[PDB]
């Protein structure tokens, strides 16, 4: 499969030897629903730590490209947009990480979910790290399952910065997040605020309130992970222009019309599986301005956002709306 290109006209208007190097974390979320975010009007405070952080924009109208990890994750990094995106040929397309890497941005992908679903396949494999096992993830024995935790993807990031001193960096952290059906496994005891909690894999058999409690508890652990990611970025804010993008890959059905989990084809998927949260945070010194919080946005906004974050322009997406101006 030879590579089909889309942005080899891309140019970086300023280089990190002539201005401040830029360091961005893009959290690729998992199964998070927009309508269970407190900032979007949910009845529960599911993001208490993200709330205390100044400079975070919550986007209340974001629609995902699809309803599954294999479908949406390549669409998120693609140049084609949702209405031309072909999941079966995405692996052979130049994607936005191929462009930024070719332009010299240091690309790191850490995965506590599954893998990059083909996004990183053209880059050297040393740039992808499996964080689902203790060989990389130092934070696994904090729960009765010894499930490795998303926050463990932040450990050792300082040594990655040290190895790329004075370069632009884009760090993708692929979250386990709210992956089901075992939502009760996805968070440590610290986040068991909502009880009782469904523990069965047979979601339709659980009490509904119990199912929601486990789901919302998992969101509390993602709140903690995003906050810690911003806090890590703040420790490098003097030498680097730092920012954090979070977007979920899709939402989740939680019993509506007897539908559970996700992956329903777009042609008849419910609203709940495509309505996703998005958050953007930047340091005041970066000069990045977020779009209005109620901008109508989709996964198509991600690729132009990453390019803008590193001062890159490509004809392919020059008219496209991003999360930032
Ligand atoms: Zn997913």
Curated annotation (Swiss-Prot):
It is found in: Cell inner membrane. Changing residue 30 to A: Abolishes transfer of phosphoethanolamine (PEA) to a lipid A analog in vitro. Almost abolishes resistance of E.coli strains Rosetta or TOP10 to colistin and polymyxin B, by comparison with the same strain expressing wild-type mcr-1. Changing residue 249 to A: Abolishes transfer of phosphoethanolamine (PEA) to a lipid A analog in vitro. Almost abolishes resistance of E.coli strain Rosetta to colistin and polymyxin B, by comparison with the same strain expressing wild-type mcr-1. Disulfide bonds join 65-75, 140-148, 198-206. Changing residue 117 to A: Abolishes transfer of phosphoethanolamine (PEA) to a lipid A analog in vitro. Almost abolishes resistance of E.coli strains Rosetta or TOP10 to colistin and polymyxin B, by comparison with the same strain expressing wild-type mcr-1. Residues 3-325 are periplasmic. It is a multi-pass membrane protein. EDTA may inhibit activity. May be inhibited by ethanolamine. Changing residue 69 to A: Abolishes transfer of phosphoethanolamine (PEA) to a lipid A analog in vitro. Changing residue 252 to A: Reduces resistance of E.coli strain TOP10 to colistin, by comparison with the same strain expressing wild-type mcr-1. This is Phosphatidylethanolamine transferase Mcr-1. Its EC number is 2.7.8.43. Probably catalyzes the addition of a phosphoethanolamine moiety to lipid A. Phosphoethanolamine modification of lipid A confers polymyxin resistance. Confers resistance to polymyxin-type antibiotics such as colistin; in the E.coli strain W3110. Its main location: membrane. One of its GO terms (biological process) is response to antibiotic. Monomer. The gene is mcr1. It catalyses: lipid A (E. coli) + a 1,2-diacyl-sn-glycero-3-phosphoethanolamine + H(+) = lipid A 4'-(2-aminoethyl diphosphate) (E. coli) + a 1,2-diacyl-sn-glycerol. One of its GO terms (cellular component) is plasma membrane. Zn(2+) binds at residues 30, 69, 249-250. This is the first (November 2015) reported plasmid-mediated resistance to polymyxin antibiotics; although it does not confer a high MIC it protects against colistin treatment in a mouse infection model. Colistin is one of the last-resort antibiotics available for multidrug-resistant Gram-negative bacteria such as K.pneumoniae, P.aeruginosa and Acinetobacter. First identified from a pig farm in Shanghai, China in July 2013, retrospective screening detects the gene in (slowly) increasing proportions between 2011 and 2015 from pigs and chickens, and also in hospitalized patients in China. Belongs to the phosphoethanolamine transferase family. The chain holds residues 219 to 541 of 541 of the full protein. The keyword Lyase does not apply. Phosphorylated at Thr-69; may represent an intermediate in the catalytic mechanism. Keywords: Antibiotic resistance, Cell inner membrane, Cell membrane, Disulfide bond, Membrane, Metal-binding, Phosphoprotein, Plasmid, Transferase, Transmembrane, Transmembrane helix, Zinc.
């Amino acid at each position: 499969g030879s590579t089909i290109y889309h942005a080899k006209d891309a140019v970086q208007a300023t280089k990190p030897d002539m201005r401040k190097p830029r360091l961005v974390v893009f959290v690729v979320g998992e199964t998070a629903r927009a309508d269970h975010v407190s900032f979007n009007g949910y009845e529960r405070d599911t993001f208490p730590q993200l709330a205390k952080i100044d400079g975070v924009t919550n986007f209340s109208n974001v629609t995902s490209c699809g309803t599954s990890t294999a479908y949406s994750v390549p669409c998120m990094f693609s140049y084609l947009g949702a209405d031309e995106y072909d999941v079966d040929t995405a692996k052979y397309q130049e994607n936005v990480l191929d462009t930024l890497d070719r332009l010299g941005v240091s690309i790191l992908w850490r995965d506590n979910n599954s893998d990059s679903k083909g996004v990183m396949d053209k880059l050297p494999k040393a740039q992808f790290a499996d964080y689902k096992s203790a060989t990389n993830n130092a934070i696994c024995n904090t729960n009765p399952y010894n499930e490795c935790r998303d926050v463990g993807m932040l450990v050792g990031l300082d040594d990655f910065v040290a190895a790329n001193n004075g370069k632009d960096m884009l760090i993708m952290l692929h979250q386990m997040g709210n992956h089901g059906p075992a939502y009760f496994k996805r968070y440590d005891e610290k986040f068991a605020k909502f009880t009782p909690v469904c523990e069965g894999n047979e979601l339709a058999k659980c009490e509904h309130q119990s199912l929601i409690n486990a789901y919302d508890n998992a969101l509390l652990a993602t709140d903690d992970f995003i906050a810690q990611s911003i806090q890590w970025l703040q420790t490098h804010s003097n030498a680097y222009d730092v920012s954090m993008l979070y977007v979920s890959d899709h939402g989740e059905s939680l019993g509506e019309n007897g539908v559970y989990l996700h992956g329903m084809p777009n042609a008849f998927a419910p609203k709940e599986q495509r309505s996703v949260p998005a958050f953007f945070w930047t340091d005041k010194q970066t000069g990045i301005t977020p779009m209005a919080t109620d901008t109508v946005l989709t996964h198509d906004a991600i690729t132009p956002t990453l390019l803008k974050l590193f001062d890159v322009t490509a004809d392919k997406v020059k008219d496209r709306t991003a999360f930032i101006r």
